[PDB]
């Protein structure tokens, strides 16, 4: 069974230049002069796409800035120039042999400007009041770079339990990062405090960003 | 157009079946070699079995030889994939693809549908709790202004999420979901324009298929 390496594992280039990532194939995947090596692009949500088939032949409706080179057992994909919408990991796929196997993918990410999150905190709905929980959210949208930490505190004295945290991966509009940040408790204990804060310290900001939420208004 | 739609996805406990289904149309089904792909949560890619333009040849992936089959009605213009003996190995996206027509050798899959998910655990359905997320009553309006949408609560995945029912497309971000104490959760943002809200509406729509739930909340300010 044929065996795929894909390099770099991940790879981050800025905008209009260029981008190669390499498959080694554990043995040969030529034939009748052709070779058996696929492309493939995933982008976050979608299925993938073909982009290159058989090493060389550019798949209709994909832009000429993708093209692959190789033979037998060393493959690579070039991108040039790089655009915002190439965000997404790409997979190597040989057919020569069943079974048919992939590599563990390369992941592009874009280099930029740094910037600033713009945060917003959100108060528990009264309609989750109700049924005895309360959850306060905080998103921290469009920043670069993806490096980020979120701190709750509640009447100045911070907590780490019940703190849930999520991010997106890059944007493929403005290559940005975004995160989620929702602390739940008992709505019980919700009423005993006031003041709900989430602070956001960021490389683009020596001091943290905060925003905050009190239940006297 | 080329279509393949999956369907028959769903949560199902350790040792039971499942059924899924692709949908072919736009193209000349029994000239092309089939295959189910799938994708597990770690994402990496595993070609799971292959059927021939026939249907006389078959051929599985280790992992699924003799527990899965896959089989073709070319007259329905459908690709089948049974499943049997389920394991947590076998959580994932199920693809249906189509392999390119083309001589001298193996190919290529040139098309492949959304995908259909399938979850393999002795945990039950939950619904999700959606609930609004309006600003705070003190805080200020300046240009633009932010809202969301939070999904809490709920089993398996996936829930999908829209705002103004497809609408409302950019300035969205829904979040990966998170798994805490084997329940995800997961939240929605929109920024829009602070002239049209409140004026115009704003709804976030959920839905998750495998408790047949679909909500949609309109967002309030307090």
């Known amino acids: 069974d044929i065996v795929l390496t894909q390099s770099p594992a991940s790879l981050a280039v800025s905008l209009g230049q260029r981008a190669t990532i390499s498959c080694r194939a554990s043995?040969?995947?030529?034939?009748?002069?052709?070779?058996?090596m696929h492309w493939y692009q995933q982008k976050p949500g979608q299925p993938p796409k073909l982009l290159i088939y058989?090493?060389?032949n550019l798949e209709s409706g994909i832009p000429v800035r993708f093209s692959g080179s190789g033979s037998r057992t060393d493959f690579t994909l070039t991108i040039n120039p790089v655009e915002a919408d190439d965000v997404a990991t790409y997979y190597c796929?040989?057919?020569?042999?069943?079974?048919?196997?992939f590599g563990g993918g390369t992941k592009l990410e874009i280099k930029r400007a740094d910037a600033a999150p713009t945060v917003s905190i959100f108060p528990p709905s009264s309609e989750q009041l109700t049924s005895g929980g309360a959850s306060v959210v905080c998103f921290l949208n469009n920043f670069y770079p993806k490096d980020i930490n979120v701190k709750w505190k509640i009447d100045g004295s911070e907590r780490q339990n019940g703190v849930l945290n999520s991010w997106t991966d890059q944007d493929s509009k403005d290559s940005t990062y975004s995160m989620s940040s929702t602390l739940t408790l008992t709505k019980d204990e919700y009423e005993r405090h006031n003041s709900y804060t989430c602070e956001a310290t960021h490389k683009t900001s020596t001091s943290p960003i905060v925003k905050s939420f009190n239940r006297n208004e | 157009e080329v279509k393949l739609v999956e369907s028959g996805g769903d949560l199902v406990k350790p040792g039971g079946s499942l059924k899924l289904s692709c949908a072919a149309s736009g193209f000349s089904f029994s000239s092309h070699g089939m295959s189910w792909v799938r994708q597990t949560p770690d994402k990496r890619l595993e070609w799971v079995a292959l059927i021939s333009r026939g249907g006389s040849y078959t051929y599985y992936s280790d992992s699924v030889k003799g527990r899965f089959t896959i089989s073709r009605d070319n007259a329905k213009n459908t690709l089948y994939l049974q499943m049997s003996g389920l394991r947590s190995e076998d959580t994932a996206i199920y693809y249906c693809?189509?392999?390119?027509?083309?001589?001298?050798?193996?190919?290529?899959?040139?098309?492949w549908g959304q995908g259909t998910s399938v979850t393999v655990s002795a945990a039950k359905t939950t619904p999700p709790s959606v609930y609004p997320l309006a600003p705070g009553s003190a805080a200020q309006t300046n240009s633009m202004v932010t809202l969301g949408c939070l999904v809490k609560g709920y089993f398996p995945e996936p829930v999908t999420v829209t705002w103004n029912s497809g609408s409302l497309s950019s300035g969205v971000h829904t979040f990966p979901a998170v798994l805490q104490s084997d329940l995800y959760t997961l939240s929605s943002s929109v920024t829009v324009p602070s002239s049209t809200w409140p004026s115009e509406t704003v709804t976030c729509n959920v839905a998750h298929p495998a408790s047949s739930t679909k909500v949609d909340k309109k967002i309030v300010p307090r």
């Open positions: 693809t189509r392999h390119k027509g083309l001589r001298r050798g193996t190919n290529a899959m040139d098309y």
């Open positions: 796929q040989q057919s020569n042999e069943d079974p048919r196997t």
């Open positions: 058989r090493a060389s």
């Open positions: 043995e040969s995947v030529d034939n009748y002069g052709n070779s058996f």
